[PDB]
Amino acid sequence: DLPKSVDWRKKGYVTPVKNQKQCGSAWAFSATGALEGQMFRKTGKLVSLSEQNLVDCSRPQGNQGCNGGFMARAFQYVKENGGLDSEESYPYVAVDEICKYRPENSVAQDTGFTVVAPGKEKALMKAVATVGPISVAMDAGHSSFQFYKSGIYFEPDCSSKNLDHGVLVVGYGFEGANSQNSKYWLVKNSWGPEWGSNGYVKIAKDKNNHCGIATAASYPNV
């Protein structure tokens, strides 16, 4: 009984597209994006969250800052730390720096996170429909993705198991009148608004877990 389409951007859950620049911090942007949606669902206030706070401070939890990391380890950091600072108060500079977490500037918290049944696009569809934006890993390691500009993205060389890039599923939809025709996942990237379609990409949906979008999906518990 899930909706034919979902787009959380239309309900105020999603901040404008950000840019990680030359830092392997996509996992931090995916995590802040999912926490931004859950915090909005809880309080009605959309507050941009600090990726730099995660880059600089979550090494104990197993992240490696600009050398990579994982969204579940970032949600683990926010839980163990008791908070996460706003983007305004702890700005992004795209380089590993000293941890400067300030509890008085915290605007978010989580108690851990929930994992979507791995490899199941229908499970991911249910989480997107009932929770809000969901953090996901994908295989983005292709020039077709770097130069992606519009339309549904399908890449034959995509893997659903060996992934390399965290992104945020903000909804799903279809092209035209038939809800089961030309389906896609609405994905927010962190390569800036100029990349792709206003910083977003439509990834083919119900095409065998294309690019691994439902392989490692999760969301923070607020």
Residue numbers in the entry: 1 to 222
The authors write:
Reactive site mutants C25A and C25S of cathepsin V were used in structural studies.
The pattern II group (binding shifted to the non-primed side) consisted of structures of nine protected peptides and one non-protected peptide that all bound uncleaved into the non-primed sites.
